[PDB]
Amino acid sequence: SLPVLQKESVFQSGAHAYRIPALLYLPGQQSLLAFAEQRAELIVLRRGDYDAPTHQVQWQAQEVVAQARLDGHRSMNPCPLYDAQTGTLFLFFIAIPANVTRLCQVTSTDHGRTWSSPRDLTDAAIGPAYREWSTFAVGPGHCLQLNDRARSLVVPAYAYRKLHPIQRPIPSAFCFLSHDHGRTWARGHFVAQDTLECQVAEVETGEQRVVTLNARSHLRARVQAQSTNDGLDFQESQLVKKLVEPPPQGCQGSVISFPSPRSPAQWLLYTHPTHSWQRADLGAYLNPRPPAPEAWSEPVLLAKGSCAYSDLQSMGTGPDGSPLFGCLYEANDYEEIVFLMFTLKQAFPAEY
C-alpha cells in the first residue's frame, strides 16, 4: 500500500450497477471527467476539479449523460478524448438494441458540461466490413491524440470477426484514425487474432514517434504491437511476458505515455491486476524505454484485493514535483469504482 494523495470511491453499488470506467483530464481547467456505465444501460459522469490548495480532486454530483444514447439502444464503453487543437471534448461510445452494433459520439465545447446530439459514425468509420462482424466496441477508457502536425485522433477498438467457419467469432484489436478532428475516419488493420479491449499511446522510440497498442488476451501475457503510420498498420504483435494476464479470460488494462523524468522523450505507465490467475492486486508498471517489451519494470501494488478494469490519466505535475496521475478502477467484486491519485515519486521512489 504505497503512499497516495487520494483514494475514494466515486461510484458504489451493492448490485454492481457501475462498471467500465473511463477517465479524462482537461489540462486548462485542471479537472477530471470520470465516466462509467450504469445498468436501460446508460453512461453516467462525475466531474471534479483538482483543488491545488488541498491537492485533492473535489468530485461533484453524479450526472447521466442523456445525450449519449440512441432511442431503444443501450449505451456502453465510454471512450473520452480532449482535442487540444480545438478544445472540444469527444465521448465515443457503443450503442446496441447480424451486426446491429453502432459506433457513436457526443461532443462538448463547454468542458463537458453540456453535450451535442449523438452522431452515429458507424457507416463513415467501418464501411463494408461492418457485415463481416458480429459486434465490436471501442476502448473502454480514454483514447489518443497524436503530436503530429494534424493532431490526429486515434480510437482503440476491437471486433469479433465472423470468419464463418461455423464457429464462434474471434476478436481482434485495431484502431480508428482521423487526421481532421473526426470529420473523416479510417479503419486500421487488425493486429493478432484473439485480442480484445486495448488502449493506445504515442512514444518516441529511436528517432521517430510510434503508436503502441497494448491489448487484453486469452493468453498468460499481454499482447503489444507498434505502428509507424498512426495505427493504420501494426508490425508483428508480440507477447509481453513481464505483463501478466490471468487466464483464461484476461483483463482489460490501461496505458498512457508521459514526459520522461530525465534519453527517450516519453515513458509509459500501465495498470492492470498482477495476480497470476485472478483479477486481483492492481499494479502500476513503468517502461522507461517504450515500447520495448523487455523494458517493463516489476509492478508496484496500488491496491490489494479484488480489482478489474482501470483507466489512467496524466494530470500535470504533483505537489512533490514529479508527474501526477489519476487512476479509475473497478474494485471489491465490482461493487465500486475507485479513484486513486498519486505521483511518480510516491509510486516509484527508487526513481527518486
Which residue numbers belong to the known binding site for substrate?
19, 39, 158, 160, 197, 216, 279
54: exposed, middle or buried (Cβ count in 10 Å: 0-12, 13-18, 19+):
exposed
Question: Determination technique for this PDB entry?
Answer: X-ray
Among 269, 258, 263, CA closest to 203: 258
Q: 208, 223 in Cβ contact below 8 A?
A: no
Instruction: Compute the distance between CA of residue 95 and CA of residue 40 in angstroms, rounded to an integer.
Output: 11
The CATH code that applies to domain 1-352 is 2.120.10.10
Verify cis geometry, omega within 30 degrees of 0, for the bond prior to 156.
no
- Cβ neighbours, 10 Å, residue 192: 18
Strand, helix or coil for residue 344 = helix
Q: Dihedral sign for Cα 87, 175, 11, 116, please.
A: positive
What is the edge-to-edge ordering of all strands in the sheet holding 6-12?
6-12, 336-343, 323-331, 300-317, 280-287, 266-273, 254-259
Helix (H) or strand (E) holding 347: helix 344-347
Cell numbers at 110, concatenated: 463547454
Among 342, 203, 197, CA closest to 282: 342
Instruction: Compute the distance between CA of residue 269 and CA of residue 26 in angstroms, rounded to an integer.
Output: 19
Domain coordinates of the chain in residue numbers? 1-352
**Integer angstrom CA distances of residue 5 from 52, 54, 56, 192, 325:** 12, 10, 7, 39, 10
**Integer angstrom CA distances of residue 109 from 83, 183, 213, 248:** 10, 16, 29, 42
Instruction: Compute the distance between CA of residue 194 and CA of residue 224 in angstroms, rounded to an integer.
Output: 12
Instruction: Compute the distance between CA of residue 331 and CA of residue 309 in angstroms, rounded to an integer.
Output: 8
Q: Which residues are the active-site residues?
A: 309, 330
Q: 333, 16 in Cβ contact below 8 A?
A: yes
| Interior angle at CA 230, CA 219 and CA 182, nearest 5 | 110
Q: 227, 213 in Cβ contact below 8 A?
A: yes
